[PDB]
Amino acid sequence: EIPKEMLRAQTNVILLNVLKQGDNYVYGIIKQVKEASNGEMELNEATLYTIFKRLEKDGIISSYWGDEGRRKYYRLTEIGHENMRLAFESWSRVDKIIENLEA
Amino acid sequence: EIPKEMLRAQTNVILLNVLKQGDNYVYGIIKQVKEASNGEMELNEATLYTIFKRLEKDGIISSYWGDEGRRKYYRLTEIGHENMRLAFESWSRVDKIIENLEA
């Protein structure tokens, strides 16, 4: 009974943290999420595109070409980093407040 | 730049954790949130009613009369407890997955 919108949010947060670790292309990200989740999270390429199109429209990530047949890299934007920082900061405070409740 | 809906969610989570600690009446909850948040979170009674009417409609909390002029107590429901458990469980896994990303 976890809301579909919460699962979506968790998926977003995981993907944005992959990007936080470094700019990355689709197969790299998918591989990284699969390993980090112990196989629990195996995204398909089409799923990432749906998610990234929206994150990009929202100014949270952008993309550019690598080098060497070129790959497309996705990058967390500066606005993207700040939103994550504020979300992380505010949810840690929530954690601190609960902790206090439990003391 | 924290979304208004995320602040609302954080407020909900804090209030539900007050209730998780024990059934409680409005002034008790408000006092407890104010202390636990170091004065950062001072809710008014009307704000709680708006929030609790919706949580109750959603089957997450309920209310009943205490004893002794009676007070009205709010209680986390069994469904309420389970939803919190699942939300907590799934967000801890998200944390574990990020941790792995950072290793």
Ligand SMILES: CCOc1ccc(-c2nc3ccc(-c4nc5ccc(N6CCN(C)CC6)cc5[nH]4)cc3[nH]2)cc1
């Ligand atoms: C680019 C942005 O970057 C972001 C980075 C992190 C987050 C983010 N980190 C989170 C950590 C925890 C939660 C969260 N933990 C919860 C525990 C319980 C609940 N309850 C469950 C019961 N129902 C009734 C209310 C919600 C919600 C919860 N929400 C949300 C979170 N969102 C969002 C955006």
